């Protein structure tokens, strides 16, 4: 990332609308600014049958205030589902080339 975007999160509900999701977002990426975790709780009224988007999949929508410079947007290279973070243990017993 290069800048912190202005994001608003929405989810597709059974009423074929976009319900607000910002109250349940645990953003560790600092508004799409750097790599990190991202966790939410799916609301009970989320729908995979609504006609706003292709059916069979629950949908989340993020609204971003437009940035004039096209190079300010981040360069996404992959999203991991069911993701966790792990850290090495007993680092003092590991060879140096592993860290290099």
């Amino acid at each position: 990332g290069f800048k912190a975007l202005n994001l608003s999160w929405f989810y597709l509900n059974q009423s074929n609308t976009w319900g607000s999701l910002d109250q349940l977002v645990d953003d560790q990426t600092h508004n799409l600014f750097d790599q990190g975790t991202w966790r939410t709780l799916l609301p009970q009224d989320a729908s995979n049958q609504a006609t706003l988007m292709p059916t069979g999949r629950y949908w989340l929508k993020a609204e971003i205030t437009h940035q004039a410079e096209s190079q300010d947007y981040p360069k996404i290279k992959g999203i991991l589902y069911n993701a966790a973070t792990a850290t090495l243990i007993n680092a003092e017993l590991v060879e140096t080339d592993h860290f290099i």
């Binding site: 069911n82 973070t85 243990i89």
Partner: protein
């Protein structure tokens, strides 16, 4: 003596020492077996990364509890300002994958 003289100055008088190694971090995705609707992976779970060149095993410790499920991210699309143009960089129902 020239080598022992400098070592005495840096380490004993100035009290400086070499820095220690820094532990690295990884991001792990978990897929659950088909018979579990939800699973809880507690903080501190150990994962195996094999061994280094000299054979010492490599282990990693989870940092946060994970409540995994059977879902999977499949689609990613957006539209932008110009009118407006839309695109679908990623989709699993179709055979379009992220570069």
């Amino acid at each position: 003596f020239p080598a022992r003289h400098r070592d005495l100055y840096y380490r004993e008088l100035l009290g400086l020492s070499p820095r220690k190694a820094q532990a690295d971090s990884v991001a792990l995705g978990i897929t659950l077996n088909t018979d579990n609707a939800e699973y809880l992976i507690p903080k501190g779970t150990l994962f195996d990364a094999g061994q280094d060149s000299v054979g010492n095993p490599l282990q990693y410790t989870s940092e946060t509890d994970l409540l995994a499920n059977q879902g999977e991210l499949t689609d990613l699309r957006w539209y932008r300002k110009d009118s407006w143009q839309s695109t679908i960089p990623l989709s699993l129902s179709d055979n379009i994958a992220l570069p």
